[PDB]
Amino acid sequence: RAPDIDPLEALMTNPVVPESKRFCWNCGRPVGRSDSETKGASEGWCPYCGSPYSFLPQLNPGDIVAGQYEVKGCIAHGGLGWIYLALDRNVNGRPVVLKGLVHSGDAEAQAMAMAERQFLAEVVHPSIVQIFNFVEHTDRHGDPVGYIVMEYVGGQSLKRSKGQKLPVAEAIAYLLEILPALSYLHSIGLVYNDLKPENIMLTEEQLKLIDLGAVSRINSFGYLYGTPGFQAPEIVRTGPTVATDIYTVGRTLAALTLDLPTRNGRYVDGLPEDDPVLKTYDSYGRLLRRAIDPDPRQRFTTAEEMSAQLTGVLREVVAQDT
Ligand SMILES: Nc1ncnc2c1ncn2[C@@H]1O[C@H](COP(=O)(O)OP(=O)(O)O)[C@@H](O)[C@H]1O
Ligand SMILES: [Mg+2]
Ligand SMILES: [Mg+2]
Numbered sequence: 001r002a003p004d005i006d007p008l009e010a011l012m013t014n015p016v017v018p019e020s021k022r023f024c025w026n027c028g029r030p031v032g033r034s035d036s037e038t039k040g041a042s043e044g045w046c047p048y049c050g051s052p053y054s055f056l057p058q059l060n061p062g063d064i065v066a067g068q069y070e071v072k073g074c075i076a077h078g079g080l081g082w083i084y085l086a087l088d089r090n091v092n093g094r095p096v097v098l099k100g101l102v103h104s105g106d107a108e109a110q111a112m113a114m115a116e117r118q119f120l121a122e123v124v125h126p127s128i129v130q131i132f133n134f135v136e137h138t139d140r141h142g143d144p145v146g147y148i149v150m151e152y153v154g155g156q157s158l159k160r161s162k163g164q165k166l167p168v169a170e171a172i173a174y175l176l177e178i179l180p181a182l183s184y185l186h187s188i189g190l191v192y193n194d195l196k197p198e199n200i201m202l203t204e205e206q207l208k209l210i211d212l213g214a215v216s217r218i219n220s221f222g223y224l225y226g227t228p229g230f231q232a233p234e235i236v237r238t239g240p241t242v243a244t245d246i247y248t249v250g251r252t253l254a255a256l257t258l259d260l261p262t263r264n265g266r267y268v269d270g271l272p273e274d275d276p277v278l279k280t281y282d283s284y285g286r287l288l289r290r291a292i293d294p295d296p297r298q299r300f301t302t303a304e305e306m307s308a309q310l311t312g313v314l315r316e317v318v319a320q321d322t
């Protein structure tokens, strides 16, 4: 007899953060480390900034959130802690994903965080992860914490290391599927703000943007956070704009296709000289340079304009590859 296995079990990770991946959410310093003196605690306070940390899951298998979501376990651990897998009692027991909203905060801070992100439930695009709900639950210490509830997206991110860079035609075809989602966001006065390979999921059917945490209104300055090597240089002066999103498209294509120099763990600004890929595909190199121009006024004016030029580049790359 062949066994009946629960396919959810293979989708979940062991709910322990390895010591090499433990950092303070506030100051970024390593925390919870074992030394030649003492063993590293899974929860405590950062010795440098005094912020509380916890690498323990805050939702356990069998927990019911807001009488709707049955927690099954952990999918991954990120900047905002654990990402949980749950089954939605209102939508046929469909597996869904829960993620925290803030690293720390009292009841009022949690309630404010939920309310400010509620508009994401209105974002409707086939290439953007769907947000279903904002729910409250108590953490491992008994204090209420807020969670975003989202669609479970299959596959893996587009993040590629130095040895597995995408062929140019493949990368362009991927971004051509992403650019309409950005055009859709820009059409409703929103900026995605966090485009990078890690935030693009490749499924058996399509590409999907995840991590809507940075999604903000155009020219707002409430959220200026970003990754050195992806974020537009002028974000402090202008706040998120269509121009800053175009810059991230350029950096995303470069990070997927080029062996970009890295310094202190981040990609360096601009594009490397005499790069074999950019010498091979000239129109592609020209498009990337325009997209990452330090002057935002020199970049593609709209995502639709960038898509039009990018389609032209794809035809040229495909012709050259013959
Ligand atoms: N909606 C989702 N569906 C499926 N897996 C998800 C979803 N959101 C996040 N994940 C998983 O968690 C990982 C990190 O997600 P993300 O939101 O980027 O967290 P962080 O920015 O904190 O690292 C993803 O690469 C994916 O494996
Ligand atoms: Mg992310
Ligand atoms: Mg985020």
Ligand SMILES: [Zn+2]
Pocket: 024, 025, 026, 027, 028, 029, 046, 047, 048, 049, 050, 051
């Ligand atoms: Zn700290």
